[PDB]
Amino acid sequence: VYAQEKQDFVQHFSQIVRVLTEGHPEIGDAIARLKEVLEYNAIGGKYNRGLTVVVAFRELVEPRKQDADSLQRAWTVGWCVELLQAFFLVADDIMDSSLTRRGQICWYQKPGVGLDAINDANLLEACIYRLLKLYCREQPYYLNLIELFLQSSYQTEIGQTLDLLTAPQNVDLVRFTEKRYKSIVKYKTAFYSFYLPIAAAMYMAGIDGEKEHANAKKILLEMGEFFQIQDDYLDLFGDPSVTGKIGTDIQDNKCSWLVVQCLQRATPEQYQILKENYGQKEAEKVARVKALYEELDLPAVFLQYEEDSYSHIMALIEQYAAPLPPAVFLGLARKIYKR
Amino acid sequence: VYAQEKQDFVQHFSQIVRVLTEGHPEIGDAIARLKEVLEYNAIGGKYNRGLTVVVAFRELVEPRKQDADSLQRAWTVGWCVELLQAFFLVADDIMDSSLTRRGQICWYQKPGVGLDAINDANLLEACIYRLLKLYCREQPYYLNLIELFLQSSYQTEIGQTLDLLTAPQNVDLVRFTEKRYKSIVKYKTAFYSFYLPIAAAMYMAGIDGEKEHANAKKILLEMGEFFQIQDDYLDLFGDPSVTGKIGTDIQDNKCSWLVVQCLQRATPEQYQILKENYGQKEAEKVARVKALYEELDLPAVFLQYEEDSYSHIMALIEQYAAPLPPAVFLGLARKIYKR
Numbered sequence: 144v145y146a147q148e149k150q151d152f153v154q155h156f157s158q159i160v161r162v163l164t165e166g167h168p169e170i171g172d173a174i175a176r177l178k179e180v181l182e183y184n185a186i187g188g189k190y191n192r193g194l195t196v197v198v199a200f201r202e203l204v205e206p207r208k209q210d211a212d213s214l215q216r217a218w219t220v221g222w223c224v225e226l227l228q229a230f231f232l233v234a235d236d237i238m239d240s241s242l243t244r245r246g247q248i249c250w251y252q253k254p255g256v257g258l259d260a261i262n263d264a265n266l267l268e269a270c271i272y273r274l275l276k277l278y279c280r281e282q283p284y285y286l287n288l289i290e291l292f293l294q295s296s297y298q299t300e301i302g303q304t305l306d307l308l309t310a311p312q313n314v315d316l317v318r319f320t321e322k323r324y325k326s327i328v329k330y331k332t333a334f335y336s337f338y339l340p341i342a343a344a345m346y347m348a349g350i351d352g353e354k355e356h357a358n359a360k361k362i363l364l365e366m367g368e369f370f371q372i373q374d375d376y377l378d379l380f381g382d383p384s385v386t387g388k389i390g391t392d393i394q395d396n397k398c399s400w401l402v403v404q405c406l407q408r409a410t411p412e413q414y415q416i417l418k419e420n421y422g423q424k425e426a427e428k429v430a431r432v433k434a435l436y437e438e439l440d441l442p443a444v445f446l447q448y449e450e451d452s453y454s455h456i457m458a459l460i461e462q463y464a465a466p467l468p469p470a471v472f473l474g475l476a477r478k479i480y481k482r
Numbered sequence: 483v484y485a486q487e488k489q490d491f492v493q494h495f496s497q498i499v500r501v502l503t504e505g506h507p508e509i510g511d512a513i514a515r516l517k518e519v520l521e522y523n524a525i526g527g528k529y530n531r532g533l534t535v536v537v538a539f540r541e542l543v544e545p546r547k548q549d550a551d552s553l554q555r556a557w558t559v560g561w562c563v564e565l566l567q568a569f570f571l572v573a574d575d576i577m578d579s580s581l582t583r584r585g586q587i588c589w590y591q592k593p594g595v596g597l598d599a600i601n602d603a604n605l606l607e608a609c610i611y612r613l614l615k616l617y618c619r620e621q622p623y624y625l626n627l628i629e630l631f632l633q634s635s636y637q638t639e640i641g642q643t644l645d646l647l648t649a650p651q652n653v654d655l656v657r658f659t660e661k662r663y664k665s666i667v668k669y670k671t672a673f674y675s676f677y678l679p680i681a682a683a684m685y686m687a688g689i690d691g692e693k694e695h696a697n698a699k700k701i702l703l704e705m706g707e708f709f710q711i712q713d714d715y716l717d718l719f720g721d722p723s724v725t726g727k728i729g730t731d732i733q734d735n736k737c738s739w740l741v742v743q744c745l746q747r748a749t750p751e752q753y754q755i756l757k758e759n760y761g762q763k764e765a766e767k768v769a770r771v772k773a774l775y776e777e778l779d780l781p782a783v784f785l786q787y788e789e790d791s792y793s794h795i796m797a798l799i800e801q802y803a804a805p806l807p808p809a810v811f812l813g814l815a816r817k818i819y820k821r
């Protein structure tokens with residue numbers, strides 16, 4: 144499904160840019176900057192979210208209604224998801240004071256960008272809507288897509304606010320509850336990473352019903368919870384030469400699924416070991432946390448969670464996939480649940 | 483027109499907030515933060531942009547079609563303009579490293595906000611669209627308003643990019659040309675400050691024609707150019723006990739209308755006096771610029787510009803106001819051109 148169309152998708156970017164950078168010579172300079180912004184930040188991910196739109200649109204539309212223009216539009220809206228992602232990242236890395244991203248210098252950290260990245264992020268967001276105007280204003284789902292991107296923006300922003308309130312990078316754990324962890328993930332990542340791209344395909348295919356969308360959302364948000372929990376696990380236990388990432392959740396005082404669990408289980412004594420070491424950057428003090436999680440057999444708790452999670456998803460799919468082809472959902476679960 | 487409805491408008495804010503902060507207990511914390519963001523940043527301006535929507539809607543709709551619900555919606559969309567303004571300011575003050583705004587500490591500069599303001603700004607933007615959903619999704623102009631706010635966002639962002647490229651707060655004047663000054667003002671401030679609110683009233687009143695809108699835009703953008711040029715003049719020559727502002731365009735290396743003119747007129751010698759002193763914060767070095775502008779009789783050049791500008795506007799109004807009541811436009815020119 145995905146490896147099979149990643150070429151046409153990543154190749155269409157050029158067009159996405161050509162159009163977004165074309166009557167008005169006076170502003171050409173700013174447009175030059177926009178090009179640069181898009182080239183640095185929309186590129187270099189694995190493109191799974193955007194791609195999900197394309198793949199799903201193939202699965203959902205009767206192939207008789209998949210002309211060149213229709214596909215073009217699915218590529219375009221797929222790139223709209225990747226631009227939403229890019230907008231959030233650029234802005235999130237400023238906020239976290241991150242150094243790298245996708246293995247390069249964060250955009251804001253480049254010489255002579257700095258906090259100008261704030262506006263660059265805002266343009267990334269704007270390009271979504273330009274693109275929808277240009278490719279979709281005549282389509283019957285035009286407004287549905289706008290509302291979905293705008294709503295996907297809002298929930299992510301809310302989730303971000305929620306995380307910022309939860310984890311002031313300053314030492315506190317009583318606010319790291321499972322209720323709250325789950326909330327953060329739903330609003331901050333799941334909605335836009337899992338629901339938004341399938342939903343966009345759905346609208347593109349004429350499937351606009353609230354019921355259908357509620358059903359698909361129910362599956363997708365639970366998939367999204369898992370995805371993140373696995374991300375949290377692998378931040379620390381992922382072989383880094385598989386992953387590509389080397390993890391810093393413990394140094395960055397994150398509200399990781401791990402710590403949440405660790406806190407549910409710890410003696411009042413061990414809370415101390417964690418109160419003392421979480422957030423510090425001393426390797427010794429980072430080791431004494433990993434080593435605590437390990438003492439609490441949390442890698443086992445994960446495996447245990449991944450199994451249940453895998454059933455729940457299949458159950459959800461059995462129950463709510465209809466009348467969409469289960470393959471829409473399985474195509475994603477495949478990308479997540481390795482054996 | 484304006485003093486006459488500023489009460490109902492500023493009073494409606496409470497409702498705007500009540501609604502934007504109301505099913506979902508898990509996120510209530512973030513909503514609390516949102517409330518705070520809106521209270522600090524949507525409040526304390528003079529509300530001229532928002533108000534323009536309300537006043538214009540009164541002028542444009544047959545009074546038989548101005549029920550309670552219609553008004554409610556004009557207040558709401560007026561507040562949407564003020565939220566757009568708030569979103570841009572919060573983000574612009576981070577970018578400039580400003581200290582104050584509307585006579586208080588900039589939001590980002592408050593203890594324990596910082597660059598979290600980036601997300602706070604993004605929520606300000608989001609609230610626009612929530613508000614439009616809640617009050618206007620059933621109206622026939624719903625999509626027109628979304629497109630207008632989104633487009634107003636994009637042009638402002640472009641203008642911001644353009645300004646950032648023009649004025650790196652690092653010393654340069656060859657890029658401060660009149661063509662470029664004019665471009666910056668059109669994209670960065672005029673469009674959203676002058677065109678957007680009248681346009682929103684227009685759409686609200688059933689007047690959606692491209693022609694009408696082109697006409698209104700033509701008047702409004704030229705009004706907007708003046709407004710800004712006057713702002714630039716008064717930044718330096720405004721009696722500060724009238725204004726409320728004390729100006730720092732020269733210290734901040736801005737691409738002010740003043741400097742632009744100064745550069746058009748200066749001997750190759752005087753370019754030097756300006757190359758040496760513009761952007762410095764030394765009062766002596768700030769004085770030696772003001773004193774140069776004064777030596778070049780620029781306060782006279784302004785008066786000269788304000789006169790011509792005043793004719794051009796009236797001409798534009800005579801020519802393009804129809805079939806809107808000229809009073810829509812005069813109501814604004816009144817707020818700008820004191821004798």
Ligand SMILES: Cc1ccc(-c2cc3c(N[C@@H](Cc4ccccc4)C(=O)NP(=O)(O)O)ncnc3s2)cc1
Nearest residue numbers: 445446447449450453473474476477478480481482
């Ligand atoms: C800890 C743990 C326990 C069980 C699993 C299971 C994964 C899995 C599974 N995973 C697929 C991925 C998958 C998932 C869902 C639908 C389709 C495909 C897989 O790993 N295929 P591969 O050829 O690479 O070994 N497919 C069918 N049953 C199961 S049970 C994964 C992790």
Ligand SMILES: Cc1ccc(-c2cc3c(N[C@@H](Cc4ccccc4)C(=O)NP(=O)(O)O)ncnc3s2)cc1
Nearest residue numbers: 145189191192195336337475477478479480481482
């Ligand atoms: C909607 C959506 C968003 C992100 C993803 C990502 C999947 C993924 C990823 N998944 C692996 C699978 C995987 C399984 C277990 C642990 C890590 C990685 C994968 O794509 N395998 P495939 O053989 O299909 O190319 N690996 C590294 N980064 C990412 S980011 C998937 C779906």
Ligand SMILES: Cc1ccc(-c2cc3c(N[C@@H](Cc4ccccc4)C(=O)NP(=O)(O)O)ncnc3s2)cc1
Nearest residue numbers: 784785786788789792812813815816817819820821
């Ligand atoms: C430098 C300079 C030269 C001429 C003017 C003019 C302002 C003006 C003008 N201004 C109105 C404001 C105005 C503008 C446009 C339409 C209506 C009202 C005004 O100042 N009224 P006020 O009672 O406070 O003295 N009205 C009619 N003709 C003119 S000519 C302003 C500044």
Ligand SMILES: Cc1ccc(-c2cc3c(N[C@@H](Cc4ccccc4)C(=O)NP(=O)(O)O)ncnc3s2)cc1
Nearest residue numbers: 484528530531534675676814816817818819820821
């Ligand atoms: C669309 C729009 C946006 C901002 C304005 C502003 C007008 C204004 C403003 N205008 C003065 C007039 C003015 C004239 C000349 C110099 C300064 C101020 C005014 O409102 N007079 P009014 O008697 O109607 O209350 N003074 C201080 N700040 C601002 S911000 C007007 C219209």
